[PDB]
Design a protein around this ligand. Structure first.
Ligand SMILES: Nc1ncnc2c1ncn2[C@@H]1O[C@H](COP(=O)(O)OP(=O)(O)OP(=O)(O)O)[C@@H](O)[C@H]1O
Ligand SMILES: [Mg+2]
Lengths: 995, 177
């Protein structure tokens, strides 16, 4: 086991943490003191990540109030020990991680068994300081965390020596060099960015002229514009000639941590909101006072919404400020109202907050185990008082907030009974049931959202469960693989809070245009708001455009590895998601793809394209050619490389294999074509020593001269190109392979390749398509004959897909002296896998549920909302208020450019439309479009204009688009360009035709 | 704040701008396919200046636009693949302007890249400017490249035959400007 990582489970997490990091995690034993919501959330996340063993310590008996945020406790468990009822359910999350229970902790020395000790809100500050001194002086990593209502903190102490090995987890920067001067000024190539900050370190390779500068030596970086940097003298090494590629390196960093006692007096802060800087110090005293209080008052916290205890705490804070004047700062008074809010909420347990700190803390643990990412140094404090509703609508006093013998008791402690009722009666749509979706549903079960007689949840997802999802989508188990995410997940949370039983509508419908008959005008008009747990841009902008049309709030979010964001979309007030979208990855120029690659990304893109061509497009085309008797007409219409479609057909049929050995020969021959003949061919067309552009050698800069390959079955990439090509072609023609039986023996393949003849490379419009038509077989000769197309599945390691692409890419990499890449890197690029971890997912989801509270109060003050960006690598928190909507003006009338629209009753006539807008709005419709089609234009010729100008809109659509409008459709959205009274084009709202 | 307008509307406005006879822009005939798909234009390209080797040639083309215009680029391909040093059998082109530069773009500092501020007329200007002055820093593995580099008479002979084939597709369609 020692040194292996189950890639099928951990794939998405490995791309975040790396192999090395995960191996150090698998030697580390973690202990968590206190298993309420904060504990179980931290533990859930650490156990999913994969450490050596998880041990939990909580002997106290279960109470109903503890069910506010502990998703693993039920009503039936009351009275029992929290550790014992939590451990079994924790154990289910990762069979590779054993979960144990510490009966007792009166012997502090038991902590020596452990590598990381996390102490939650059940441990006194007295005991926290004791346990920390023991950890600090024994070399054990100590982390601590507390939630008090809508407030919270975390404290990190990794000891006198700790080494950060990779501080950001981002991939190292590189770039091609054109010149190195004696003083060390590296000038880049042809206008590429390096991306390097001051004090980075870099190595060089392929630098001709400076021999021992390529041997692994590091150079510190002084940046000189975006296209240059300096690295000190280089006269000793030689004199620059040509070529060269630099590569960034992260050097280790030794950092030191101070004990908890030392930091209570002199804390080091990491800020969670730069708009609340001043609160950090206030809360540092406050949180300590909350312990001095509990010592004085028999362990009890301030009573909920109680003023006596609040003024007592304000006293305790003032007194502490006089003991510690550097921690509050000169001339800085106590923020009495903040401390007052702290006491009013000391007893609260808020799902969204418990999730925020659970995810963040779980990550601080993996950094403690592994040396990956920069730990928090050292204290961090957080509040979300912007979640509180307007006191006028929902009063907060000692009667609104008292308990009522419910699970939601410690949420009422913050918000009041009537407000929790409003949460319960909410009608909400959750699009997607994946990592964010599962965390969202747990949070909603803990909230009771939709549990009311007026409320409900609709959750939808057309995907199933795969094993790699079990690492962060924790409502699913290995026995659930294959089932539908939404149905398993809704069943899963009704177990957790049976108050939701029968109130979650779990669909398996994909959200897009084709399912608008299920999700109809009536479906949307009922909802209070919409929540996205989507992973792709088409689904996010479709849901967005639908929330704009129906004027419904939208809660959008997302994660990339350690990074996450949240966005709040409010009708009539903020921008939508589509406004502030991201630009998809740059397409690779066709010249770099087809003839002059310089990265492995170019050989994998080329290799995928070739996979898709060989084993999918070709079968699809042969089966279309035998099925559709007018394929040739549609293919001549179909402009792109028609001769290559017809040559694909003719190849598939003129030489079809009948046994596996013919597939082997085909694969070896293709090897020769792609990597020997085609390379020699390119070299004939542009010779190695060709000096074409300016007098300079042709293969200079980003152009690398290739070398034809001499097949060597002992070269692993050469071998697996033929093994995979052979098995995939065998699949295309329904030919049983001997490798599906057992794994491939090289002597078998070598015996066939040894008795093969290898053609030498010979270097050298209407007739060309007709002779190919005549050569093709007539479909009538081939009965029942089908080719089986291949459907690229990246996550099946037996199916030869990534195997072929790896080999193919890497062979082409050999061709162009590009370093090869392993199976996992190819899977990541070829398969476009997004790195994911459960820690970031939980944190983001919590922040989202802290904005949901604001939606329930119909808040319309844009400043009360918070859009989040986190990077747990750093760790960095950065909130900002949402951007207000663009506004526009036509004819001195102002309108909202995202949300406003003209409403028109009935399937009006185009003429009546134009006249209605000139009389009523002063706009002269110039151009009018429906979806993708242009219906009307003011510049149209007479014959085009008169036939269109007389039609009603639905008939107009049918005329222009050649399609009936369905009967289910109730409304249509039209886009117009128009002129104003002055004759100048103006941007104007859209039109909603209520039929 | 550059391109607040819709994608559909943006292409329509640039379609009306480039099809206006009064505007009269530097010779480019463009019309939508089936006057219905906004996001797929058919474009006839004629060469302006006599000094270049492609003068007096009408080469048809299609421009396909993506849903997220203009923060992605459009695809361009000649409806008949032509004899050009930067044209593959497909009809697709080696141009630096139709690909994104990547990472923080910040200034897009020295030359020729796709941006949101970039316009369709700009793409069409650069297709013509690359046609009349071919670019040999990014050649394509077509016969046309090798012939331009050695500089035999065959290069200009196959340019002429292609310009004659291009002239073959102008009479159909009364108004020839
Ligand atoms: N158009 C859509 N309608 C409804 N749900 C969708 C749509 N598109 C994507 N989704 C869903 O959103 C969810 C996103 O979750 P997530 O990406 O965390 O899991 P995943 O895609 O299975 O994981 P992996 O990224 O490792 O393959 C998926 O279940 C996906 O099927
Ligand atoms: Mg995904």
């Amino acid at each position: 086991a020692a040194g292996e990582i189950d890639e099928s489970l951990y794939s998405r997490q490995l791309y975040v943490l790396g192999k090395e990091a995960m191996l150090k995690m698998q030697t580390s034993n973690v202990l968590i003191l206190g298993l309420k919501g904060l504990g179980v959330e931290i533990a859930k996340n650490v156990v999913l990540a994969g450490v050596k063993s998880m041990t939990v310590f909580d002997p106290e008996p279960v109470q109903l109030a503890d069910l506010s945020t502990q998703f693993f406790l039920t009503e039936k468990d009351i009275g029992q020990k929290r550790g014992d009822v939590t451990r079994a359910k924790l154990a289910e999350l990762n069979a590779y991680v054993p979960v144990n229970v510490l009966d007792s902790l009166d012997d502090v020395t038991q902590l020596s068994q452990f590598q990381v000790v996390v102490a939650t809100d059940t441990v006194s500050l007295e005991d926290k300081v004791k346990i920390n001194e023991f950890c600090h002086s024994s070399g054990i990593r100590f982390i601590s965390s507390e939630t008090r209502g809508l407030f919270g903190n975390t404290f990190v102490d990794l000891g006198d020596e700790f080494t950060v090995l990779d501080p950001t987890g981002e991939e190292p920067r590189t770039g091609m060099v054109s010149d190195i001067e004696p003083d060390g000024t590296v000038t880049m190539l042809d206008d590429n960015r390096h991306g390097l900050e001051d004090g980075n370190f870099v190595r060089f390779s392929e630098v001709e002229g400076l021999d021992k500068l390529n041997d692994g030596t590091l150079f510190k970086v002084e940046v000189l514009g975006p296209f240059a940097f300096r690295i000190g003298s280089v006269k000793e090494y030689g004199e620059y000639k040509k070529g060269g590629i630099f590569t960034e390196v992260k050097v280790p960093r030794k950092i030191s941590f101070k004990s908890l006692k030392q930091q209570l007096s002199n804390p080091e802060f990491v800020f969670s909101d730069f708009a609340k800087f001043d609160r950090a110090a206030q809360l540092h005293l406050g949180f300590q006072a909350l312990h001095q209080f509990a010592v004085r008052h028999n362990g009890e916290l301030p009573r909920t919404m109680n003023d006596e205890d609040a003024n007592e705490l304000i006293k305790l804070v003032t007194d502490l400020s006089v003991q510690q004047p550097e921690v509050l700062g000169e001339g800085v008074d106590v923020n009495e109202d903040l401390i007052k809010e702290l006491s009013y909420q000391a007893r609260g347990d808020i799902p969204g907050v418990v999730a925020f700190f659970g995810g963040l803390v779980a990550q601080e643990v993996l950094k403690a185990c592994s040396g990956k990412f920069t730990p928090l140094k050292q204290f961090m404090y957080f509040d979300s008082l912007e979640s509180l509703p307007d006191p006028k609508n929902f009063p907060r006093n000692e009667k609104t907030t008292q308990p009522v013998n419910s699970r939601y008791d410690n949420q009422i402690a913050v918000f009041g009974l009537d407000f929790q009722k409003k949460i319960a009666n909410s009608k909400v749509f959750l699009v997607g049931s994946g990592a964010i979706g599962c965390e969202m549903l747990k949070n909603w079960a803990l909230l009771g959202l939709g549990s009311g007689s007026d409320g409900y949840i609709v959750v939808t997802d057309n995907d199933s469960i795969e094993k790699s999802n079990l690492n962060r989508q924790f409502l699913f188990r290995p026995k659930d693989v294959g089932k539908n995410k939404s149905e398993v997940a809704a069943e899963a949370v009704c177990a957790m809070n049976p108050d939701l039983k029968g109130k979650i509508n779990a669909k398996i419908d994909k959200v897009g245009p084709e399912t608008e008959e299920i999700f109809n005008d009536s479906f949307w008009e009922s909802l209070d708001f919409v929540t996205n747990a989507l992973d792709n841009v088409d689904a996010r902008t479709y849901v967005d455009r639908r929330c704009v049309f129906y004027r419904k709030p939208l809660l959008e979010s997302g994660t990339l590895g350690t990074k996450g964001n949240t966005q709040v979309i409010i009708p009539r007030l903020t921008e939508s998601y589509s406004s502030s979208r991201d630009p998809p990855e740059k397409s690779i120029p066709l010249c770099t793809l087809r003839s002059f690659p310089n990265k492995i990304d170019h050989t994998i893109a080329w290799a995928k394209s070739l996979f898709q061509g060989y084993f999918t497009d070709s079968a699809e085309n042969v089966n279309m050619y035998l099925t559709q008797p007018n394929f040739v007409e549609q293919t001549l219409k179909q402009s792109g490389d028609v001769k290559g479609v017809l040559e694909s057909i003719s190849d598939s049929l003129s030489s079809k294999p009948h046994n596996f050995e013919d597939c082997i020969k085909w694969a070896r021959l293709e090897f020769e074509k792609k990597f020997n003949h085609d390379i020699k061919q390119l070299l004939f067309n542009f010779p190695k020593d060709a000096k074409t552009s300016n007098g300079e050698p042709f293969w200079s800069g980003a152009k690398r001269a290739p070398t034809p390959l001499e097949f060597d079955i002992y070269n692993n990439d050469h071998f697996h190109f033929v093994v995979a090509g052979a098995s995939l072609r065998a699949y295309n023609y329904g030919i049983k392979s001997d490798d599906s039986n057992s794994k491939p023996n090289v002597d078998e393949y070598k015996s066939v390749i040894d008795h093969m003849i290898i053609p030498e490379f010979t270097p050298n419009g209407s007739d060309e398509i007709d002779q190919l038509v005549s050569s093709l077989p007539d479909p009538s000769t081939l009965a029942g004959f089908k080719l089986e197309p291949v459907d690229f599945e990246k996550d099946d390691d037996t199916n030869h897909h990534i195997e072929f692409i790896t080999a193919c890419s890497n062979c082409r990499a050999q061709n162009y002296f590009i370093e090869t890449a392993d199976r996992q890197k190819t899977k990541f690029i070829a398969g476009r896998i997004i790195p994911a971890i459960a820690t970031t997912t939980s944190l983001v989801t919590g922040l989202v549920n802290l904005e949901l509270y604001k939606l329930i109060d119909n808040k319309t003050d844009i400043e009360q909302y918070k859009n989040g960006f986190v990077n747990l690598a750093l760790p960095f928190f950065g909130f900002s208020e949402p951007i207000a909507s663009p506004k526009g003006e036509y004819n001195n009338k102002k309108y909202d450019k995202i949300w406003d629209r003209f409403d028109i009753k009935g399937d009006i006539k185009l003429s009546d439309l134009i006249e209605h807008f000139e009389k009523d709005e002063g706009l002269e419709i110039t151009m009018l479009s429906y979806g993708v089609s242009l219906l009307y234009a003011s510049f149209f010729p007479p014959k085009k204009l008169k036939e269109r100008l007389n039609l009603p809109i639905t008939q107009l659509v049918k005329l222009v688009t050649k399609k009936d409008i369905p009967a289910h459709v109730s409304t249509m959205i039209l886009e117009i360009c128009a002129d104003d009274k002055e004759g100048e084009d103006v941007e104007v709202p859209f039109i909603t035709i209520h039929l | 704040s550059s391109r607040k307008s819709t994608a559909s509307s943006l292409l329509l406005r640039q379609y009306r701008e480039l099809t206006d006879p009064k505007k009269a822009i530097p010779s480019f005939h463009i019309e939508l396919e089936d006057d219905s798909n906004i996001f797929t234009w058919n474009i006839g390209v004629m060469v302006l200046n006599e000094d270049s080797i492609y003068h007096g040639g009408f080469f048809k083309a299609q421009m396909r636009f993506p849903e997220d215009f203009p923060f992605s680029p459009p695809q361009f391909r000649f409806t008949p693949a032509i004899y050009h040093p930067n044209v593959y059998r497909d009809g697709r082109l080696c141009i630096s302007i139709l690909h994104q530069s990547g990472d923080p773009m910040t200034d897009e500092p020295d030359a020729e890249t796709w941006s949101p501020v970039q316009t369709v007329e700009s793409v069409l200007i650069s297709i013509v400017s690359l046609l009349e002055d071919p670019n040999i820093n990014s050649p394509a593995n077509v016969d046309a490249a090798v012939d331009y580099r050695k500089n035999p008479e065959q290069y200009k002979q196959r340019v002429k035959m292609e310009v004659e084939r291009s002239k073959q597709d102008i009479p159909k369609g009364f108004i020839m400007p």
